[PDB]
Amino acid sequence: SGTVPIAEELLARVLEPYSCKGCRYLIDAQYSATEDSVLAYGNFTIGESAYIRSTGHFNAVELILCFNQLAYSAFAPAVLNEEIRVLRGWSIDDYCQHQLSSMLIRKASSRFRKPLNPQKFSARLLCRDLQVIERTWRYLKVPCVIEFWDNGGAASGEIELAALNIP
Amino acid sequence: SGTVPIAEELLARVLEPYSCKGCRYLIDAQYSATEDSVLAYGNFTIGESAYIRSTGHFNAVELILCFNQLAYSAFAPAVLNEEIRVLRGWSIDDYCQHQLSSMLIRKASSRFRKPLNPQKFSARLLCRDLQVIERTWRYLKVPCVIEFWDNGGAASGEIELAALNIP
Amino acid sequence: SGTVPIAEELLARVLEPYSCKGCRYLIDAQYSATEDSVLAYGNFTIGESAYIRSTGHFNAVELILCFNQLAYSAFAPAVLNEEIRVLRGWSIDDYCQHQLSSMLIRKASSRFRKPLNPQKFSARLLCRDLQVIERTWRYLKVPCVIEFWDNGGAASGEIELAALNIP
Amino acid sequence: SGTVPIAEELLARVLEPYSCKGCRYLIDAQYSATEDSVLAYGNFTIGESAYIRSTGHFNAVELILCFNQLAYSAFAPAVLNEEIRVLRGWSIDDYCQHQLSSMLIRKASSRFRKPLNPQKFSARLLCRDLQVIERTWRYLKVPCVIEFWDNGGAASGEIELAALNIP
Amino acid sequence: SGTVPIAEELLARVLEPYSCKGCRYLIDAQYSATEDSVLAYGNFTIGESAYIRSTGHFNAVELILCFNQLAYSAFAPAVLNEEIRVLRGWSIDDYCQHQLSSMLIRKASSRFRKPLNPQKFSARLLCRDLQVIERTWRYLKVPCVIEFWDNGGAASGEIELAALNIP
Amino acid sequence: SGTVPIAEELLARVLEPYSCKGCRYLIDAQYSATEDSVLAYGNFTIGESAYIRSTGHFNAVELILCFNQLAYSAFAPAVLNEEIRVLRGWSIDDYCQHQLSSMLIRKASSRFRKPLNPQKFSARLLCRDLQVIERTWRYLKVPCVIEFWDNGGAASGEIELAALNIP
Numbered sequence A, B, C, D, E, F: 001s002g003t004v005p006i007a008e009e010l011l012a013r014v015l016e017p018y019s020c021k022g023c024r025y026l027i028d029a030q031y032s033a034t035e036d037s038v039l040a041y042g043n044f045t046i047g048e049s050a051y052i053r054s055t056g057h058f059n060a061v062e063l064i065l066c067f068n069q070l071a072y073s074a075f076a077p078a079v080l081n082e083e084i085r086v087l088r089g090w091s092i093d094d095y096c097q098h099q100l101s102s103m104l105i106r107k108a109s110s111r112f113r114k115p116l117n118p119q120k121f122s123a124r125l126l127c128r129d130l131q132v133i134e135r136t137w138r139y140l141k142v143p144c145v146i147e148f149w150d151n152g153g154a155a156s157g158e159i160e161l162a163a164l165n166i167p
């Protein structure tokens, strides 16, 4: 690993958009960062779906939901301790103002094996080769890789984000 | 096209899992079917996210949410008028009992261009080469293709479903 | 890891060429796959050499023998669940017809430290950057990397395969 | 060349470990030797694989198998006529007691072009710069170079042996 | 890992420049090597600073000191068992004559989180893409990556070495 | 420049941690200061390494060692004449009690060209945009820039310090 924990209450701030909806599923997380890469791990629980009755399983909607929360979370301390080069110039204040409106999934790719236990599961996340793209929109493009597990069970994805304001 | 409409109140039954959560986004839909293929079109609106505060845009979570609703919906009249061969033996009664627990996204692939207007948008859906797979689980595998639009804007995906009970 | 197990009796089918000769040495295996990569782990035992009297150690012939069995095995479920892109179009039926005649070692590179216990040992295998080469022969070229251990002990190799029919 | 033949029945003694398994493939051989080098040539045939069903081709396992037999064979008369300096002190009696347990492949490197006819083929072998290494094990290290042919067809390798007892 | 241990007394020889100054801090180490890469792990203790009174913590000077010792150490057995290609032609005798004068840090990059316990800590080291550069000086350039830990605590660096004589 | 000299015997007090170890290398220094910046110049000599036998050159360990001494030294008169705003409230008495335990290198970045003559060399140092950071630790963060020269020869670095007590 080589990863430090992230303070709850940085998390709780970052994920308040979901918590004020009872949709925070990330219990705690640990990160590590460089000039151009972040690695994070998180532990999750799903009490109830906000959107459908009750599947009694994991869903694909919740994979995404958990990826968002972890990515959101993993980039917080990086930005704060100013470890991401391309993002120096953002305070954490900047980051939390640009969460909802300014950070987008461009393309994504999911795979599903043994259905995850929505109750106790975990994820590992790695975003790499971050690079800024100027034009008709100027965005930081963020290639990500995530993997879930828990009872066996696994899922994964390669998702590319766009983050809209920067630097 | 070559597609018939689907009665609301078949829809309303099928999508009640989302409606009882205020998360039905499919306004109406039209389908067409064969031995082994379904084509559907739908019109959507998103009043508010159930899960996050307010993005003011479309999300990836909602792409999936809309795909589910349309697929769910498109297969309803097919099963009822017994047009899907591999599914003859299901009443619509069977179908609605197997919605939540028995129908799953195996793998999926999303693409996003001009952000969709979450207020008034539409989708076109095509599932093809349905085929049953017996083994440690016996499922109908369902290769799907969907495309959204509205103001320009587009998104799309190739998602493979597993449906768990049948025939 | 992030790897699922492989059913014996898929194995037993795939490795029957060796078993009908009492030369199956792979006890069980676990794999993981992508568009263009496979990772597998296996556990081995050698009862007796088929070819020489008795060395009382591991040999280089048996390194190869074990690599073959694991590679053979690791690609089976990938092909079956159609996870390898370049190989979609093969059923598992195709695969088992092309095992003996159509899958070849082009070049290889071995290293040997602490002699492996031929009785209880294990391997880790990773094939990557698979790519098809058309010409006077049309083959899928398969760059592989394997490592053995057990009592300490280690061996390894970088072997390139050619698989002759496809796609 | 500049090479003398090797008596069958020296061969037959040396390769009995394989013959008692029906795995002797070296038909006859010729050698030449110096203080510190051996050159050998051999002619081979493979009736059937001992280990797999039937490939109908050459394999990599059999390349090694043939290298072993030829190396084993080429060093026999050298040791007997006491031509290898570092090995004087071994009778041929010593040599045949240390075959199985005491002679090992450290590292190896194979290349494969036109598939060899397993029925009628030949090899040329050259081991050079033999040198003894004392330590936690005391071995004679033996850098070797071999090349096969037959119908065209070629294969080759640079293999390093360790021989464990000496002098 | 996949790494063998390194004999103390190879270490003790290699690190004598520091030991004769009471500044050897590497207790033991394990390595693994290829044509062009070395991986090593080590365990350290710092009894007292040689240079300053007493900080009661880890320092940056000691990070470097430990990196040197581990790199010095990790390359020893590689060179001896002649596993590094570009360095074949050096005996270990060559290596120990070129330690002090001929091996240099060109550029380096350090990061520090939770202060390391100078008493019991460890490191992981990986040097890769070694390549020789001829000119006004002819050096082997050696891109390295190291990471420390122990009580939590972490530090890391990307340091590039120049080694001056070779091959 | 625009810099005043610093009295030896302020130096000698500040650097006693190194001198009592025969590791003071700063001969004399000159500084200049503002509300939030210090500039210093120093002249150095290295009699012998404390830690290794004898390289006959400059090392990276000694770059750091010299940076510490100069930074340590440059901040002394600033604090004394109370010129650093964020540090007013420290006497020089405070400063010398917090040297060893309370002043740390967070991250650092070194570059090396023409090897410095360890006998007669000089440095130029500039720390800027000092700013206090409250939290789980409350530190003054100190971004620094240093450059060495002497016979040509140059080295440089951007090092960030943390100073732990203040104000």
Ligand SMILES: CCCCCCCCCCCC(=O)O
Binding pocket: A067, A068, A071, A072, A075, A100, A103, A104, A105, A140, A142, A161, A163, B055, B059, B060
């Ligand atoms: C500046 C890099 C930002 C990385 C974290 C953003 C991840 C958020 C994922 C998108 C969430 C959403 O679409 O609502």
Ligand SMILES: CCCCCCCCCCCC(=O)O
Binding pocket: A055, A059, A060, B067, B068, B071, B072, B075, B100, B103, B104, B105, B140, B142, B161, B163
């Ligand atoms: C029998 C074919 C069923 C096709 C409609 C099923 C689509 C439902 C998509 C999965 C929804 C979910 O994961 O909650």
Ligand SMILES: CCCCCCCCCCCC(=O)O
Binding pocket: C067, C068, C071, C072, C075, C100, C103, C104, C105, C140, C142, C161, C163, D055, D059, D060
């Ligand atoms: C299509 C990729 C096939 C990968 C598995 C083939 C590995 C078999 C190794 C060669 C065995 C032999 O030479 O008999």
Ligand SMILES: CCCCCCCCCCCC(=O)O
Binding pocket: C055, C059, C060, D067, D068, D071, D072, D075, D100, D103, D104, D105, D140, D142, D161, D163
């Ligand atoms: C003393 C030199 C011995 C040279 C002949 C030994 C070659 C045998 C090759 C290894 C065979 C094996 O691993 O079973």
Ligand SMILES: CCCCCCCCCCCC(=O)O
Binding pocket: E067, E068, E071, E072, E075, E100, E103, E104, E105, E140, E142, E161, E163, F055, F059, F060
């Ligand atoms: C030939 C590659 C040598 C790798 C080991 C050298 C590492 C030594 C680091 C430099 C030590 C010093 O500057 O005193």
Ligand SMILES: CCCCCCCCCCCC(=O)O
Binding pocket: E055, E059, E060, F067, F068, F071, F072, F075, F100, F103, F104, F105, F140, F142, F161, F163
């Ligand atoms: C209050 C600012 C203090 C600036 C001088 C501190 C520089 C000391 C550098 C760190 C020395 C060490 O790690 O031992």
